[PDB]
Design a protein around this ligand. Structure first.
Ligand SMILES: O=C(c1ccc(-n2nnc3cccnc32)cc1)N(c1ncccc1Cl)[C@@H]1CCCNC1
Ligand SMILES: [Mg+2]
Ligand SMILES: [Mg+2]
Ligand SMILES: [Mg+2]
Ligand SMILES: [Mg+2]
Ligand SMILES: [Mg+2]
Ligand SMILES: [Mg+2]
Ligand SMILES: [Mg+2]
Ligand SMILES: [Mg+2]
Ligand SMILES: [Mg+2]
Ligand SMILES: [Zn+2]
Lengths: 84, 134, 103, 50, 26, 58, 104, 122, 135
RNA sequence: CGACUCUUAGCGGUGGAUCACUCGGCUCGUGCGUCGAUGAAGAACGCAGCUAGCUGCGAGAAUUAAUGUGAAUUGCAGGACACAUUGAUCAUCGACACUUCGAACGCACUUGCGGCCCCGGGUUCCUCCCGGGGCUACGCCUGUCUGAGCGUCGCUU
RNA sequence: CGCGACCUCAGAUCAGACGUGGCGACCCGCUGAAUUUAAGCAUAUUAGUCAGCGGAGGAAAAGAAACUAACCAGGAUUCCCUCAGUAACGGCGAGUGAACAGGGAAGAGCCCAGCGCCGAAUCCCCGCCCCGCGGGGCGCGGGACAUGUGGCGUACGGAAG
RNA sequence: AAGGCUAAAUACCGGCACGAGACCGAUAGUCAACAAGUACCGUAAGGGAAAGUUGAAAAGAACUUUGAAGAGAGAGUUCA
RNA sequence: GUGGAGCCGCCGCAGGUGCAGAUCUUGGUGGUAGUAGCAAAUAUUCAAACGAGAACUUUGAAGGCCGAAGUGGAGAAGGG
């Protein structure tokens, strides 16, 4: 009753995936995510989990715009076109 | 002795830039010496090899006395192919064995607009060095 | 835990002292750094004397040190009165000025 | 479920397209070391979790 | 083909407790 | 056809009409389970689906 | 060693369960699921007494011994028994404190 | 039959769009040739016609946007995608003019008592 | 003062920290006024504030704010220090007149619990182990 | 005698220690010290002739332009060799472009339902009619427009 | 009744700007333990540290005495060596613990309100032009701010006439 | 005193680019030398691996023969 | 003898300095052992066909079970 027969009544899901971090941690009744806390404005990170930071620091993604800022830095942020 | 504090000396960091080089650095590093008739005439020590230069191999299983044009330049495998040196497979289909361009002597170049300018610039950079010897 | 005749010691290591440790490995590299900052400054003020203005004669306060003479902060604004040079012209000619000093 | 929302089946389509072997021209490439797709998912053993 | 695939970690979890109980004389 | 999934049946009805110079009776659409939208464009009774197929390539 | 090598959850099983009382990693699934974590015995664990970068690397010698050692090293460069018994083939060489003129 | 970018910059707007809408027809009837059995010589043409179709769109956008910067030249209040995008913390610095402002109490303090050059030997 | 925000007044530690209901919050009430005036208006730079009233339950402070991007503040170099990006949010760092009175800083023999910079920069520097290279 | 067992050895298995190698760490030091409403970090999905991952990208999608460089890319095909055209490839990177979510911005998050303005075709339309575009978050500052008050008055009635 | 001036306030998809969120090694403001040590344990210690919360910046904070001193006196801040495991705190137990002299690294000083004087001599926004690039300045003209006090000289080392 | 500003000397286990070492050498060194915060596990918070080396060059064993094939017997490539 | 690119003696220096044990850690291999086992819900049989090869596939024939609160016909959640 306690074990392998009450596992059969697992039929309806507590969490769905989150819009902001893509997790399966968005709780369908609390309406909040368990990783980022989506309807809060800030990102949910804590210093008591050092590993859970490095899953989602800056650098663990594409960096679609900080790739370019680091490349535009080393020439001083030009705005004219070029010399031919 | 190396004196510049902005160039390496370690085996691990020179082997990394050698195998992961861009393909325009990689033609500078697949260079080849010239012959004695051709460096007495163009006074330049060596050139990067290209598609139609004719070559005699100087080391290996195939050595000397066979001038032959090169036919393909694998930069990915750091290897040139020469029109005469080949190898029979088990199938009977002969294919080119590939050799390294520092094991290679250019005996006649291929001259276009740009290969003239590079030889001219690599030559002028030597008699400036002969003028330091006052 | 103690033993025979020795000192009775109070080592101050009962605290997380390994996160606050200072290693002077950069201390060669900061000595050649602050030499270069002296050299690149000495030619920036090129005719002016290095180590800046003239400092005053100052006797050290205590019973321990009042026999000796020390460089000071600046001139008291009555020396510049008596020597006859203006206090807003003194520091631009190379004279350190300390307005809170009494003689 | 046969009642699904559009985010679920544009998620289940992405997991269905990358459940696919390597092409056999790709082990002939120079210097590689992949030899079979190790990220293959069977629909009974490993389940996606929504 | 040929090259197959890896299986799964054993992931054993302990269970039983000194068989069928049993208490010594008091 | 196979159609981009941001299109609806009003846009497909004008895209097929203006690229292929033929009338469209009705359209049915289907997100096929490998991700893409499949369109079933039924031509008008004036036109034939066969010769339009032979001039678009197949 | 870079930091703790303890960046790993591990508590002992403690009780019976017939395995040694080293801490075990948590969870399941993966191979690293009941393996013995940190301690200087374990594959993947932490080494005994990890080296610290504040070991005393540099030594003092007071100046009148540094000068003693460098007066003792020039005077031995002027004896042909000592300078040949270090390896330098000075057999064909002239007068043993070799000086040359300042033109060099 | 190669499409060069500098070949297209001296052309009119209605000539580019005719030659853009041309390339969209040959890009589509090559996808018909792919989705049928196959005509493998015409499946390497599907890359030199979709990289040629980016060249026409770039020349259209660069004769549209650099013509649009001539229009707001010398105007107050130009649009946001014509202003320089140099790293938001730089758009909130003052400017070279306001950073070089001096008050009148500090203008006469610099001209009455200016910094002299000197040395001390004789 | 502050009540210690703890459920049913039970703090669970050693008895010296049972202090629910006699605790005083070492930052002043004027600095709380400067803060949430500057917390609501984030585009504004707070200069300082003063006192205008109190009754029994409430205390009233007029907080004076500076708009850094107005061209009467962006010009006039007597005021251009506060339109410079290190002066963002001077109360969340305690840099106003009401803020720095809680930091306990000052010159003198009464104030060298903060003898380099601040209270926790004096703390780090007396509690670091400065084992040198030749030691 | 033949098996079974035991101990040595030769050979073969099973296994992956050892040694040799190292495009990885680790530590120290140096220079710099730069994100975002002009849409960041992060997430989702899509992009190759044959492509699943990784890596690179964004419907211009395994990259366009520009400048440097000067004949390759390469697992296999295909197609431009022209380079006294603009020239393959690679690097650089300042010009253009940059789907959806996200501070995330019309409201919702169920790809749900809008509201104004302009442009194309239908009623040549104002009145909930297809497509395209633009605008529409909150706080807050200076100004402008509208105007609330048995708030303080002034002239009038 | 109405009209008007203000004063306190509201609305706008008003003209133009700004704030939000990320990283957080170092820095600032808060808040805050218990393991542990005391051979037990309460004050103490751990420790004003870990964890929590908020703000930055290439540095930050501090900073030109409501200082130290006590003698022939020194002279902003920060940092280093020393002072010093010292004076002092502590079931005076376990333990905790600065500063001023002194020698160096670096060195730099200044501003306002007030007080009065000056016909508000000051500033913002828009309109067109002298002249301009890669745009911001003096000028020409109204609409505002502002006397409930803008700007000039002025700062305790004195200042003004 | 109860208002304000201020460079340098100082800090830097995150970022961008570097140079080095009496360091480790694939059970070591980062968890990760490899499609690694990946495979996998948990409703979630979170947990988290294993896995380097043919050869100088694929020259990666044509062809013959046994068997339905896997697998052999020859032959061949190679210093091997 | 295998192996195919590095290695050692002496004088000093410096350590992550020598294993049989820790219900040690990780990996590998035994004996037990061709053993325990492949026993809940009545049941299989004949011929044929395709095939290298048939107790199990298919097809026909016989004999049975479920027996309409089904071992039948469709769904929801879940799966993908
Ligand atoms: O299933 C078990 C059961 C029996 C023995 C073990 N053991 N014994 N030594 C052991 C060593 C290691 C692991 N497990 C072990 C575990 C469980 N039961 C059980 N029987 C008797 C007393 C208590 C219980 Cl709970 C059920 C109860 C319901 C009816 N069917 C039997
Ligand atoms: Mg919100
Ligand atoms: Mg290295
Ligand atoms: Mg508790
Ligand atoms: Mg000593
Ligand atoms: Mg053997
Ligand atoms: Mg910054
Ligand atoms: Mg390009
Ligand atoms: Mg619209
Ligand atoms: Mg191994
Ligand atoms: Zn989330």
């Amino acid at each position: 009753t306690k074990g392998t027969s009450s596992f059969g009544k697992r039929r309806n899901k507590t969490h769905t995936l989150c819009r902001r971090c893509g997790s399966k941690a968005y709780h369908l009744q609390k309406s909040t995510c368990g990783k980022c806390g989506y309807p809060a404005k800030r990102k949910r990170k804590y210093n008591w989990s050092a590993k859970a930071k490095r899953r989602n620091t800056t650098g663990t993604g594409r960096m679609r715009h900080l790739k370019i800022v680091y490349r535009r830095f080393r020439h001083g942020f030009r705005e004219g076109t070029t010399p031919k | 002795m190396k004196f510049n504090p902005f160039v390496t000396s370690d085996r691990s960091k020179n082997r990394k830039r050698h195998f992961n080089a861009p393909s325009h650095i990689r033609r500078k590093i697949m260079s080849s010496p010239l012959s004695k008739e051709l460096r007495q005439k163009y006074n330049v020590r060596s050139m990067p090899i290209r598609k139609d230069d004719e070559v005699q191999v100087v080391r290996g299983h195939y050595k000397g006395q066979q001038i032959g044009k090169v036919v393909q330049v694998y930069r990915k495998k750091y290897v040139i192919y020469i029109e005469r040196v080949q190898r029979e497979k088990a199938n009977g289909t002969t294919v080119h064995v590939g050799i390294h361009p520092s094991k290679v002597v250019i005996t006649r170049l291929k001259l276009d607009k740009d290969r003239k300018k590079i030889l001219e610039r690599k030559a002028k950079s030597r008699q400036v060095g002969k003028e330091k010897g006052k | 835990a103690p033993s025979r005749n020795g000192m009775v010691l109070k080592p101050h290591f009962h605290k997380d002292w390994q996160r606050r440790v200072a290693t002077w490995f950069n201390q060669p590299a900061r000595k050649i750094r602050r030499r270069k900052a002296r050299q690149a400054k000495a030619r920036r003020i090129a005719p002016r004397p290095a180590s800046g203005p003239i400092r005053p004669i100052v006797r050290c306060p205590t019973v321990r040190y009042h026999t000796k003479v020390r460089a000071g902060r600046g001139f008291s604004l009555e020396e510049l009165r008596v020597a006859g040079i203006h206090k807003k012209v003194a520091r631009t000619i190379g004279i350190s000025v300390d307005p809170r000093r009494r003689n | 479920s046969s009642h699904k929302t559009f985010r679920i089946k544009r998620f289940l389509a992405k997991k269905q397209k990358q459940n696919r072997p390597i092409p056999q021209w790709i082990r002939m490439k120079t210097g590689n070391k992949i030899r079979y797709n190790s990220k293959r998912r069977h629909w009974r053993r490993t389940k996606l979790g929504l | 083909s040929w090259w197959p695939l890896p299986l799964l970690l054993l992931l054993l979890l302990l269970l039983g407790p000194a068989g069928a109980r049993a208490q010594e004389d008091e | 056809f196979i159609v981009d999934v941001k299109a609806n049946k009003h846009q497909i009805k004008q895209a097929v009409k203006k690229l292929y110079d033929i009338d469209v009776a009705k359209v049915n659409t289907l997100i096929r389970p490998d991700g893409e939208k499949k369109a079933y464009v039924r031509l008008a009774p004036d036109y034939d689906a066969l010769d339009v197929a032979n001039k678009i390539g197949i | 060693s870079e930091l703790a090598g303890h960046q790993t959850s591990a508590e002992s099983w403690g009780t019976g369960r017939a395995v040694a009382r080293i801490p075990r990693v948590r969870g399941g699934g993966t191979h690293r699921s009941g393996q013995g974590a940190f301690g200087n015995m374990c594959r993947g664990g932490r080494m005994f007494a990890p080296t610290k970068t504040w070991r005393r690397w540099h030594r003092r010698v007071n100046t009148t011994q540094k000068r003693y050692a460098i007066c003792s090293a020039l005077a031995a460069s002027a004896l042909p028994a000592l300078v040949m018994s270090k390896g330098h083939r000075i057999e064909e060489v002239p007068e043993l404190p070799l000086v040359v003129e300042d033109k060099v | 039959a190669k499409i060069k970018a500098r070949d297209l910059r001296g052309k009119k707007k209605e000539e580019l769009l005719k030659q853009l809408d041309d390339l969209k027809v040959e890009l589509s009837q090559l996808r018909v040739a792919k989705v049928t059995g196959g005509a493998a010589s015409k499946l390497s043409k599907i890359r030199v016609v979709r990289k040629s179709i980016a060249r026409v769109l770039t020349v259209i956008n660069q004769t549209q946007k650099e013509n649009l910067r001539k229009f707001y030249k010398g105007k107050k209040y130009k649009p946001l995608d014509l202003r320089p995008k140099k790293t938001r913390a730089m758009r909130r610095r003052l400017n070279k003019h306001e950073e070089n402002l001096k008050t009148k109490k500090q203008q006469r303090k610099e001209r009455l008592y200016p910094l002299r050059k000197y040395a001390v030997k004789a | 003062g502050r009540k210690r925000p703890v459920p049913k007044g039970a703090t669970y530690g050693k008895p010296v920290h049972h202090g629910v209901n006699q605790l005083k919050f070492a930052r002043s009430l004027q600095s709380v006024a400067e803060e949430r005036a500057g917390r609501h208006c984030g585009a504004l730079r707070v200069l300082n504030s003063y006192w205008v009233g109190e009754d029994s339950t409430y205390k009233f402070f007029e907080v004076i704010l500076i708009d850094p991007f107005h061209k009467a503040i962006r010009r006039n170099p007597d005021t251009q220090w506060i339109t410079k990006p290190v002066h963002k949010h001077r109360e969340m760092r305690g840099l106003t007149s009401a803020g720095r009175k809680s930091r306990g800083l000052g010159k003198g023999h009464k104030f060298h619990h903060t003898i380099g910079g601040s209270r926790r920069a004096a703390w780090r520097r007396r509690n670091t182990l400065q084992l040198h290279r030749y030691r």
